[PDB]
Structures are given as structure tokens and as C-alpha cells.
């Protein structure tokens, strides 16, 4: 069923809460035993948001390999993503260790450091060229190279140096700065423009490791980003674009991380973004 007609149908009958609860009922439940070990309590932001064991990213260290991060591998679309929580004061070094070890080119941030008067993640990148950051627990150096501030997003060029080997790499930081404190955006236009800027940079392409994407918990806004991207790619690849089923794609992604899409409003917004984005995919 053409999702656009599915959309109007749900909207007129006002059944978004019902659709969304069906997804919650059918979603996968896999163990998350490592996340719940006592030694990892200060590595998790939220008690009820944990990576599954089978898909968690492991840090390359013998001490403690745990980070709250998951590999979402989309086989038909040929895209992979790492979804993670916003870094905590005690996990900023782990976060950049993961970026290094997984060979990522881009980091996608969908939250502000402060929202609703409370801290939603650490200030984990440098704000001035001449004031670099050193992460002593993981032996990395991070320098701000340049910053481009636009009305709806900011893009930063960063240098990450492995101090053990003196190798350096360029990382791109894509920061969507205008998601509202409550609810979802009224129009998907600026979010889609942002997605296309990330695509154009190469950060989603198979010559690099998976993009790292986060918000505060790494499931709501972060789930909207990867769901929209994958659905649009499938519409490009298939003979019949109307065959793409957003609810089925979301359930496939929920095999790899729990809780993706946190509200019925985020589900509706994801439909809207794919419907409006398709009016470029199909050739306009």
C-alpha cells in the first residue's frame, strides 16, 4: 500500500497511538546482559535503554569493552549505522575510541548539550581551534579545524589523533541544532536537507566505517534519521517503490537496538519525511 494513502488513512481516523503500540508489541526482545553488569552502571545514561549483546559495539581493550552503542546492519539497503547515547562525563574517551576503531568518517548529533534546562550530553568536542582536547584514558587528541554555522545545522571539521601511533584522521561533525525541546518539527524540510548534507559528505558510504549517530538516549531522533535514510534508499533501488513498508523496516531495525522511535508523533514525522523526500528520489 502506497504509504501516502496509508498516512491519510491513519490521520483521518486518528489511530497513530494504536499503530505505534502494535510496533511496540511485535518488537524483538534479546538479552542485554553486559549492559546490566554492576561495573557498567556509570556507562549508561538511562536504566531502560541498553544495547543488545548480539549487536553491541565492543571497545578494543582487555579491561572493559563496554559502550552503550549498537550496530544496525541493513542488508537489502546496503547501509550500516552505529546508534549510541550522548556521551557521559565518564565515557567521552570511550566514544572517540569507538569512532577511531570502527573507522567512521562522520558523527551525527541530533540534540543540544542543554535542553529543557538539563544536560543531555557532555561537551565532548572542542569549541575553539587553539584549545584542543586530550582523552588520557584512551590516548587520543581532538582538535577543531573549522566550523560552519547555518540556520538549522552546524558542520565542523575535526582532527582525531591516535597518540600511540601518531596517525591522524579527519572526522566530520554534523550537528542538527533546531529540533524542538518538545514534540517534533512541523515540516520535515530542514531535517531532509540535513540528511542530504550528510549523504553528500561521503559519511554514509561503504568506503568508510559506519556513521555514528546520537541524540540523548540514541533511540528516538536517532531512529528517525536512520529509518528515513534507509526507506528512501530502498525506494531508489527497487522496481516498485510503493512496496517499501516503513513499519516493516522499523521492525527490522529494532532487531539491532531497542526502542527506536519513542513516540507516535515521531512515527508520524518519519512517514512525513519519507513521503516528502520521495518527491526528489523519483526524479524531481
Residue ranges for the known binding site are 181, 215-221, 262
Is 121 a residue of the active site?
Answer: no
Compute the distance between CA of residue 267 and CA of residue 1 in angstroms, rounded to an integer: 17
Compute the distance between CA of residue 164 and CA of residue 140 in angstroms, rounded to an integer: 8
Strand order in the sheet with 133-135: 56-58, 66-74, 79-84, 211-214, 106-109, 167-176, 153-162, 140-149, 133-135
Compute the distance between CA of residue 188 and CA of residue 166 in angstroms, rounded to an integer: 42
Compute the distance between CA of residue 119 and CA of residue 125 in angstroms, rounded to an integer: 15
Measured from the Cβ of residue 210, the count of other Cβ atoms closer than 10 Å reads: 22
Compute the distance between CA of residue 255 and CA of residue 248 in angstroms, rounded to an integer: 11
Question: Which residues contribute to the annotated binding site for substrate?
Answer: 181, 215-221, 262
Catalytic residues: 215
Amino acid at each position: 500500500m502506497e504509504m501516502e494513502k496509508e498516512f491519510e488513512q491513519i490521520d483521518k481516523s486518528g489511530s497513530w497511538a494504536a499503530i505505534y503500540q502494535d510496533i511496540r508489541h511485535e518488537a524483538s526482545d534479546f538479552p542485554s546482559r553486559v549492559a546490566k553488569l554492576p561495573k557498567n552502571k556509570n556507562r549508561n545514561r538511562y536504566r531502560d535503554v541498553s544495547p543488545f549483546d548480539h549487536s553491541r559495539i565492543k571497545l578494543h581493550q582487555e579491561d572493559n569493552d563496554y559502550i552503550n552503542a549498537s550496530l544496525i546492519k541493513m542488508e537489502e539497503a546496503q547501509r550500516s549505522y552505529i546508534l549510541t547515547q550522548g556521551p557521559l562525563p565518564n565515557t567521552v574517551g570511550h566514544f572517540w575510541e569507538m569512532v577511531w576503531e570502527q573507522k567512521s568518517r562522520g558523527v551525527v548529533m541530533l540534540n543540544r548539550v542543554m535542553e529543557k534546562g538539563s544536560l543531555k550530553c557532555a561537551q565532548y568536542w572542542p569549541q575553539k581551534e587553539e584549545k584542543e582536547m586530550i582523552f588520557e584514558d584512551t590516548n587520543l587528541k581532538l582538535t577543531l579545524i573549522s566550523e560552519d554555522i547555518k540556520s538549522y545545522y552546524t558542520v565542523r571539521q575535526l582532527e582525531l589523533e591516535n597518540l600511540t601511533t601518531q596517525e591522524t584522521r579527519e572526522i566530520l561533525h554534523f550537528h542538527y541544532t533546531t529540533w524542538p525541546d518538545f514534540g517534533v518539527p512541523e515540516s520535515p524540510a530542514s531535517f531532509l536537507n540535513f540528511l542530504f548534507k550528510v549523504r553528500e559528505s561521503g559519511s554514509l558510504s561503504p568506503e568508510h566505517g559506519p556513521v555514528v549517530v546520537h541524540c540523548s538516549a540514541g533511540i528516538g531522533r536517532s531512529g528517525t534519521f536512520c529509518l528515513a535514510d534507509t526507506c528512501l534508499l530502498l525506494m531508489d533501488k527497487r522496481k516498485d517503490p510503493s512496496s517499501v513498508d516503513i513499519k516493516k523496516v522499523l521492525l527490522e531495525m529494532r532487531k539491532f537496538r531497542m526502542g527506536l522511535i519513542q513516540t507516535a508523533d515521531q512515527l508520524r514525522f518519519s512517514y512525513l519525511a519519507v513521503i516528502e523526500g520521495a518527491k526528489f528520489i523519483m526524479g524531481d
